Amino acid sequence: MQFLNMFFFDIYPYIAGAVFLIGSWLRYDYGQYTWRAASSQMLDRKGMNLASNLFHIGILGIFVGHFFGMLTAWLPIEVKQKMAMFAGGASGVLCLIGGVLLLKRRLFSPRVRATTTGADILILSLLVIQCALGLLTIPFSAQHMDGSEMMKLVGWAQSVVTFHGGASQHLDGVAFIFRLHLVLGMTLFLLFPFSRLIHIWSVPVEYLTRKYQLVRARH
Amino acid sequence: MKIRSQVGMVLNLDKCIGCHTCSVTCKNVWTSREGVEYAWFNNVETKPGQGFPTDWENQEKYKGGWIRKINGKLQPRMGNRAMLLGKIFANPHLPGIDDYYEPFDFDYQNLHTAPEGSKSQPIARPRSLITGERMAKIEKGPNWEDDLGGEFDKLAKDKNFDNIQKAMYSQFENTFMMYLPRLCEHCLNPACVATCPSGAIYKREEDGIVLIDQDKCRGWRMCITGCPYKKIYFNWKSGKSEKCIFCYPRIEAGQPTVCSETCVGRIRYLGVLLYDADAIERAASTENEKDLYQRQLDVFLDPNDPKVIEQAIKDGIPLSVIEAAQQSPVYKMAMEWKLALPLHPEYRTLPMVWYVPPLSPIQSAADAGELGSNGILPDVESLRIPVQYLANLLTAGDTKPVLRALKRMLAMRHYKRAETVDGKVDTRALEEVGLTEAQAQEMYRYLAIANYEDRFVVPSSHRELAREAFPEKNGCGFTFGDGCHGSDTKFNLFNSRRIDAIDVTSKT
Amino acid sequence: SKFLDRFRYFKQKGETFADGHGQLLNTNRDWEDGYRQRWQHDKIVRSTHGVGSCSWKIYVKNGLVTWETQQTDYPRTRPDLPNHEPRGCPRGASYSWYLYSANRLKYPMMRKRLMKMWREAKALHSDPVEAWASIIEDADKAKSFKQARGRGGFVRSSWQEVNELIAASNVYTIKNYGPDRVAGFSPIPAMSMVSYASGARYLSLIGGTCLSFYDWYCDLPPASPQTWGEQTDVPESADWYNSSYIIAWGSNVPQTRTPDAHFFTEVRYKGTKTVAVTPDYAEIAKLCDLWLAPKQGTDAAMALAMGHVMLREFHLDNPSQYFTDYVRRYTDMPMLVMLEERDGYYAAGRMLRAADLVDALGQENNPEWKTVAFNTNGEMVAPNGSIGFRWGEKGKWNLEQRDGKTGEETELQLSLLGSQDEIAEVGFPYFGGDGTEHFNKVELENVLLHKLPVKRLQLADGSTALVTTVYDLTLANYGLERGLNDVNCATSYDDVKAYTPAWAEQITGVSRSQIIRIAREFADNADKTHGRSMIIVGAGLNHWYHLDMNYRGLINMLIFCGCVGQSGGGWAHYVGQEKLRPQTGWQPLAFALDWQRPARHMNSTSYFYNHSSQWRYETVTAEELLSPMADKSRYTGHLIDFNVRAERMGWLPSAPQLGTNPLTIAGEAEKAGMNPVDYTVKSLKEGSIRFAAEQPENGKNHPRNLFIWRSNLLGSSGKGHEFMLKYLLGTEHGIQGKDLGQQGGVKPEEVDWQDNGLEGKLDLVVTLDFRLSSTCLYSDIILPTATWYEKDDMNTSDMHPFIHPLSAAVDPAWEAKSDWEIYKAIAKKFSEVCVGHLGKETDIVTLPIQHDSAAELAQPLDVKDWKKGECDLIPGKTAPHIMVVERDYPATYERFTSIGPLMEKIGNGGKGIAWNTQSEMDLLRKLNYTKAEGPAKGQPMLNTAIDAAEMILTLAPETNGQVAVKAWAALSEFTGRDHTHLALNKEDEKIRFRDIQAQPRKIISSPTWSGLEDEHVSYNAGYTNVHELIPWRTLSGRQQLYQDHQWMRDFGESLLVYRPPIDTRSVKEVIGQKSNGNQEKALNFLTPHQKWGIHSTYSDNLLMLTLGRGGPVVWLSEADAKDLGIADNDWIEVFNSNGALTARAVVSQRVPAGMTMMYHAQERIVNLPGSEITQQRGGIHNSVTRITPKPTHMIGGYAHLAYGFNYYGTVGSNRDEFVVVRKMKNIDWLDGEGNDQVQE
Ligand code: HEM
Ligand code: SF4
Ligand code: SF4
Ligand code: SF4
Ligand code: F3S
């Protein structure tokens, strides 16, 4: 138990972190043709507007919450937790609904199923699971409205990203469900560079300030 | 004032016989792969009709092209940058595969492997190339409406029938049809380039060909909506978009495109057009859409003008290109004779593939009729194809430039007949349309005789300029996988070097 | 590192432009190599397609054929003419698809059942001929595999196994029944000469039958042989550019002659006016200045009225100097016609011959074959040119206006009006009153009497008679009033008379003012330019039962305007690439004329009408086609009876020929103590030997082995599809009607009848192809053949003067072999398998009387049937020639692979001339090397297709200037005029195979053709006749307007007249019988050449299917579709007594109500569901047609009307056909997939 604990929360996070980075870099330099969002909308437009928007707007809400909540007087720990439970809770509901609809489509929509890759089914299934797990941790966090639980998880996270050993200790006594969510969440970073999730690196920010016409010179 | 060059293309619709050879040869070379089997970079549509994809000309539905805001500025019909980004998770205007057609194949092998003692003759049934499942019935194709295949009320939904009393054309005796071969327009103000969030689409400076970088494209699939001609096709397998590449591999060395050289009808002309890139926005944003045609002509420059010549030199255009521009058949048809017109100039993209309208049999009339200003030959007023239809297609609704082109072509005919049949010089029809004998003579040389060297005047793209042709000549094609192509920085993780380069530097 | 490059972001930003609207970037572009590397290829090879004639660049990449683009390096035409490049079409552009597609035939295949029995038979019979005997002679065995045809079960075999079976079966058939019980069918040799020659050469050597194709496809216009004595000679497409007025009549040029269409669209810019005449709004209309739409099948009417206006205004009112002189010198208008006595009036008889006059006008040689006319001084005369001067004498067979006796210059007169002795009333037939309920009619009289200015003459036998000119008879026939107060003649164009513009308006539906304006414009142009008016005509007119009238109507307009023989003018017929130009170089190769003469040619229409038993269902009678002025009792019998008589009279060929093995005749003639010829003539007279045509079902007179290559016969070409399946294949069929016996109809009087017709006549069907076609599907043995991109061969066309090659870009994939190598190996196996069964045999071969031979002067005045004692049986005159041919069966292979000795012994020649070709043979020994030993020792080799091609190139005058000069010299003997000047300036010219691979070559002017290959004038048919004074090979030596042959006169075709579409009566007996609940309706069934394939080739090509409608479809007008409740693309069934087909509808406005069109051939292998009418797989377009011959297309032994392979014979016309149409209910695929549908 103590061994599995140090593995998953002291060792594993760095393995998944190295694979996520070097894997992204390597696939970027040697796999440009494979770097795309892999849209399937044209093959079957039905329900995609609702489904994809719910999932992405929800998943992005989650991402913003997770990022500023674990990596960051006027906003004490218990206030942050209340925000996560409601704002983050709502986001996870939109996300899960969209995710489930997308998965139903991918698995049973003939044209999408016939043309999908294994990684597409695996990665989506894991995000639907991870999202469901996330929401299940809400009733558990409700039992510690003083933000005691959150403080532990945030302790761990910041220990990991700042390379301070012993990160697993911060988790002493946290409900098991939080363990699962953390492991599955890190696993997604491990598989990240070998799935369609690489599209995330390409969020088109430059477009907002780009001149409309582009012309490339002789080169 | 920034002079740039581009090989433009003019298609004489009057000579098109609607054979589709151009479509087949392009398909064989560029789009036979799984993922783009349904894509036809070049496709021929029969008009009246809704085309491929279905109703592509309906910008209210598809949201293609540009719009001119009240403040005078240009914006993609799709929306400004924020608006476009807001539709990224699911493009609401995206044409579905069914708007094209579900690509199919047949089970030919069943004809070979049918077991002994079959109760009926074996047969090859259709199968979907998307699902791999049996198809109960083929219900669509890329040229489904070919030769008025379909009921008039269906074909008449044709967007170009706007503002026309079309009822009369459902009458057998008033029947009319024409062909519209089309490819990518390689616009001067392409909407696809402006609607791609990743900036993967660009216009090549040296020859104006517009390409989708297959490395940099991210598959945001917004460009498909952006293009008003719907000439960008999503590769459903690779997840990236592809489009006509104007056969740059051939153009680069001075050869015609595949669809140009393979055109059985001998209707396609290729020639250089010099344009002022600094005037693109000004012209595309003119207030009245009926002015876009003329505003684009004003963007084209006179290749025989020493002023343009010097500026072109200064701006880097090679000498052979300038010379090619001076004998461009495209320039003569679009600028001199005014026979060639743009395809849908109202989209505000400043298209670079133009068309000469077609002539047609005279309309049905109470009697055999009488001689007109052209004797036994037709007068522009008698043609059965409604000029307003042609105007909606080529001139934003203005019939004036369409009539001038048709009139001039008929005048040429009148003058030539006098000469070859009566053995007389009769320039009456020419003077009526503002043409000289010499101009009608040159028109005849290019349009009628149309020698190969006259239809295609394509200069080299000069791949040696600003690059190192020597090491490339020696090592290109050896695709062993050095992993160094595609970037300018020499450092690479696999600790390798470019096969087509010189790594040992001269120390002298 | 592409990752590290992202950091040079703003470093790659160049200048902005257009005031910030754009940004110039200096970023990497290496990715562009991706498309560059796709375009790059290993090499390019020049080749073309075999069954347009376009040269293509075949691209090979990664050692495979990837795509093709047109070659553009053809020799350029004059500066004032557009060039030919790039040619091509969409079908051709998609051929590359076939090389490795899923329907490619990779290995020889055999029906499993046949293989099982074959291997068990060989195990009990060491000799393959005996093993085959044991199978075929067992009724139960034979039927077990014949019924498996088209029902799956193909299994992979091997070349060794299939070649032995083929050879064994061939030997057994030749030995037990006769060589002529073995046949082969292959079309258009011009597209791949050597590939065609391969099978034809093997068949010819072993005595088998070589079936025709020009008539079979109905591409042959009988009117051409009638008017000019020429199969088909037309101007090249470039010549259209020299025309100032063109009418595209029933020709969809852009779709049927695609690579040449630019000449038509481009000539418009030179001021040429173009008019399109098509019932529907077709692609061709899109390119014309005027669209006229007459009721389909009524075109002859419009032409008659146009001719009417032209004669009236340019020949009578204001005589055109050009036209007048032209018809005087080049037509038979001045020729005299004898009037026959009848009660109350006279009828036009045979033309007056010099022999009819007292002192035969001083003519000793062939006086009964020289026409007569009057000169400007009322003196009678026999002018030069008539066919009588062609044989038996030399120097007078030309068109010099001279007296055939004094050789003095004369001037024939046209009309007798103004020098007649009296005015007799002549009767003219009128059929414009008959017809079905689908065509407008104009009631007048079956016989229209006209006043003709006659002239009485004193015959050589004491009697007297009345004569008139063809000219007068012509003006009368058209209804031109000439002051004789003729009640039936028109008084104005509005007068509804027999053949006025007002009259035509009623029948055709085309406004009279249009008919007048265009006829006028057309004639006026011809006058101004001296004949530069042209009519391009196609299947729109040539596929009707009365194609002869449609064509003669157009031909007359052209002649009346002097357009034939003038560059830029004339009759331009384009339907099939029948023009194989190096003809006399190819014939000896293809028919083994270098080893044996003659061969066994047969006209396919009569052959299949007979053997597929379509005559047993005939509904058309000859009686209803006879003229109203004919003795109906002299023309009794079934249509097939007329064929049988034509055969025994030496008019048409027969196959099988005799009811007895022709290899056994010589053996019986010896015992009887007399030579084979005499013994056969006597046995025929006594009836001990009979023509096989008399008893086609006795079990020994039907073909047993059929070879099919470069064809999809049993799947698109074969008219009467369901009949072929039933009688030739012996398999299930979809025929709906009952035969003559079941209806109690009248049996023929020349052919035996039996209630149960013989089924499954073919013992072995062998098909060669590169794709598994409909024909292969119903064969016993399928042989994988090389595609057009995997073999060497040659191609020529009637559209241009270039000879170019087919080349192997790569070796034939898998186990495929070229046609030449396949038949060479068959020949090799045959040569060993026949040892002990066949040796040096003697064969008796019948040969019909040949056109362009001395014997064409057979029966001059009437028709005598020796079988009816009307005359003696004289082979070569009143019956076919009876020839003796020696065959060395064991030496078949050696002969196949070497150029025979006959070229040196006898020589070479064609079209009525011959020459010495020794020099050519000596050259060939050096080019092809020679046999080191054996039977053909010392003879040039023929091992490869290249050797065969060089043989063709070296022997032909079109490709060897040396031969061309000897050819013209030989012709000069007949005409007495020098013609060698036509090729002297190219005498050093010699076209080589390897040179045409580098660049297509223009051929040399040859006597084989009437157009010229020159640099100042384009090729134009009839140009040599008009400019070199060479006569047309007709009775009169001129363009024949009047056909005086007994049968032509009695069937009402002596002069052109309107003939409404015939009734096939194929719909009323079945309509409603098998209701499915939806409304049914009868519609005219038309089948023009499709846009997505050449006949059936490409019909399975995915590219073509994708650009079309994904499979078999049929077009219907919106009204008809709405009436039947049919929506666009609904499944529908089309059917009649002949069978049924299933397809999907295409609803369109451009289709006129009353007609339906299913573009020619979409075959039977793709996307066809089960039929609700037959409960079988849906049929094809030919499941609803059936052969119905026309007597006039059977005339033989009469100058221009004598036989020739593909020159004359019955045609398979069927546009008169009607079908029942309805929406389908149940869509069952009959494949056990459970994927069926129901339409409601
Ligand atoms: C390695 C990656 C991840 C880590 C370390 C992580 C960590 C956490 C933690 C610690 C909480 C409880 C918050 C508290 O302290 O009160 C939580 C909640 C949640 N997570 Fe994650 N998470 C990860 C990835 C994800 C992903 C990929 C998803 C979406 C599928 C997701 C969806 C949720 C949801 C819906 C909740 C509950 C409501 C909320 O707090 O917003 N998480 N996560
Ligand atoms: S230019 Fe080339 S890529 Fe574009 S349509 Fe033509 S053939 Fe296709
Ligand atoms: S090849 Fe030329 S003539 Fe034929 S469809 Fe294409 S553009 Fe028209
Ligand atoms: S199929 Fe015939 S017409 Fe078409 S490209 Fe080939 S040779 Fe030319
Ligand atoms: S909108 Fe640009 S899929 Fe279109 S170019 Fe590809 S990322």
Domain boundaries, chain C: 1-27, 28-40, 41-47+55-94, 48-54+188-206+576-599+787-817, 95-187+207-217+600-619+654-663+687-786, 218-235+1189-1216, 236-297+510-575, 298-509+620-653+849-879+960-977, 664-686+836-848+880-888, 818-835+889-959, 978-990+1003-1063, 991-1002, 1064-1188+1217-1240
B240 within 8 A of B214, measured Cβ to Cβ: yes
Which atom of ligand 4 is least distant from the CA of C1098? 1
DSSP C318: S
Instruction: State if residue C705 touches ligand 4 by the CB under 6 angstroms criterion.
Output: no
Q: How far apart are the C-alpha atoms of C821 and C945, rounded to whole Å?
A: 8
Tell me the DSSP string of C874-915: -BTTTB-EEEEEEEEGGGHHHHHTB--THHHHT-EEETTEEE
Domains of chain B plus CATH, in order, are 1-16+245-358+436-467 (3.30.70.20), 17-244 (no CATH), 359-435 (1.10.3650.10)
Q: Which CATH code for domain C1-27? A: 4.10.1200.10
DSSP C76: P
Q: How far apart are the C-alpha atoms of C384 and B321, rounded to whole Å?
A: 67
Residues 6+ apart with CB under 8 A from C819: C192, C194, C195, C196, C198, C199, C709, C710, C768, C785, C786, C791
Nearest to C420 by CA among C448, C447, C455: C455
B156 within 8 A of B18, measured Cβ to Cβ: no
Q: How far apart are the C-alpha atoms of C399 and C390, rounded to whole Å?
A: 12
Please report the beta strands in B380-493, taking only residues with DSSP state E, as ranges in sequence order.
456-457
Nearest to C750 by CA among C653, C874, C642, C625: C642
Q: Which CATH code for domain C1064-1188+1217-1240? A: 2.40.40.20
Two tokens, residue C255: 């779709």
CA distance B252 to chain A (A): 12
Beta-carbon neighbour count of residue C365 at 10 Å?
Answer: 14
Give the containing element (helix H, strand E) for C273: strand C273-277
Q: Which of A29, A211, A215 sits opposite C20 (nearest CB)?
A: A211
A56 is in an annotated binding site: yes
CA distance C1146 to chain B (A): 6
Hey, is the C-beta of B172 within 8 angstroms of any chain C C-beta? yes
Give the containing element (helix H, strand E) for C324: helix C321-330
Hey, is the C-beta of A209 within 8 angstroms of any chain C C-beta? no
Two tokens, residue C1157: 């069109």
Two tokens, residue C1026: 């008009």
Instruction: State if residue B30 touches ligand 2 by the CB under 6 angstroms criterion.
Output: yes
Q: Would you give the distance in Å from CA C593 to the centre of its chain?
A: 23
DSSP A88: I
Q: Which CATH code for domain C664-686+836-848+880-888? A: 3.30.30.200
Q: How far apart are the C-alpha atoms of B377 and B420, rounded to whole Å?
A: 14
Q: Would you give the distance in Å from CA C586 to the centre of its chain?
A: 18
The torsion angles phi and psi of C648, rounded to 5 degrees, stand at -65, -15
- Cα B266 to ligand 2 centre (Å): 16
Nearest to B5 by CA among B471, B440, B465, B487: B465
Q: How far apart are the C-alpha atoms of C986 and B75, rounded to whole Å?
A: 69
CATH number, domain C818-835+889-959, options 1.20.1700.20, 3.40.50.970, 3.50.50.60, 1.10.10.10:
1.20.1700.20
A49 within 8 A of B90, measured Cβ to Cβ: yes
Nearest to C994 by CA among C925, C942, C924, C947: C947
Which atom of ligand 1 is least distant from the CA of A138? 37
Side chain identity at residue C676, one-letter code: P
C54 is in an annotated binding site: yes
Nearest to C59 by CA among C789, C785, C787, C770: C789
Q: How far apart are the C-alpha atoms of C975 and C972, rounded to whole Å?
A: 5
Domains C28-40 and C41-47+55-94 alike in fold: no
Experimental method: X-ray
C1197 within 8 A of C1046, measured Cβ to Cβ: no
Q: Looking at chain C, how many residues does it have? A: 1240
CATH number, domain A2-210, options 2.40.50.140, 1.10.3720.10, 1.20.950.20, 2.40.50.100:
1.20.950.20
Domain C28-40 fold is: 6.10.250
Q: How far apart are the C-alpha atoms of B345 and B290, rounded to whole Å?
A: 8
Resolution as reported, in Å: 2.2
Handedness of CA C1082, C1085, C1090, C1096 (dihedral sign): positive
Task: State the maximum Cα–Cα separation within chain B, in Å, rounded to a whole number.
Answer: 90
Instruction: Tell me which ligand sits closest to the C-alpha of residue A160.
Output: 1
C535 within 8 A of C499, measured Cβ to Cβ: no
Q: Which residues of B are annotated as a binding site for [4Fe-4S] cluster?
A: 16, 19, 22, 26, 184, 187, 192, 227, 244, 247, 259, 263
Q: How far apart are the C-alpha atoms of B283 and B348, rounded to whole Å?
A: 9
Handedness of CA C845, C848, C854, C859 (dihedral sign): positive
* Interface touch B281/C19, C-beta < 8 Å: yes
* Interface touch A208/B204, C-beta < 8 Å: no
Q: How far apart are the C-alpha atoms of C845 and C884, rounded to whole Å?
A: 6
Residue of B nearest to A215 (CA): B203
Task: State the maximum Cα–Cα separation within chain A, in Å, rounded to a whole number.
Answer: 65
Q: Which CATH code for domain C41-47+55-94? A: 2.20.25.90
Domain C236-297+510-575 fold is: Dimethylsulfoxide Reductase; domain 2 (3.40.228)
C1039 within 8 A of C570, measured Cβ to Cβ: no
CA distance C1002 to chain B (A): 19
Q: How far apart are the C-alpha atoms of C1114 and C1133, rounded to whole Å?
A: 10
B396 within 8 A of B289, measured Cβ to Cβ: yes
Q: How far apart are the C-alpha atoms of B437 and B424, rounded to whole Å?
A: 13
Nearest to B268 by CA among B340, B211, B190: B340
C-facing residues of B in 95-154 (CB < 8 A) are: 103-106, 108-112, 114-126, 134, 136-139, 141-144, 146-152, 154
Q: Which CATH code for domain C95-187+207-217+600-619+654-663+687-786? A: 3.40.50.740
Q: Where are the alpha helices (DSSP H) in B302-399?
A: 306-314, 319-326, 329-331, 387-394
Residue whose tokens read 């005996």: C130
Give the containing element (helix H, strand E) for C306: helix C299-311
C-facing residues of B in 3-42 (CB < 8 A) are: 14-15, 17-21, 23-25, 27-30
DSSP B385: S
Two tokens, residue C265: 């669209």
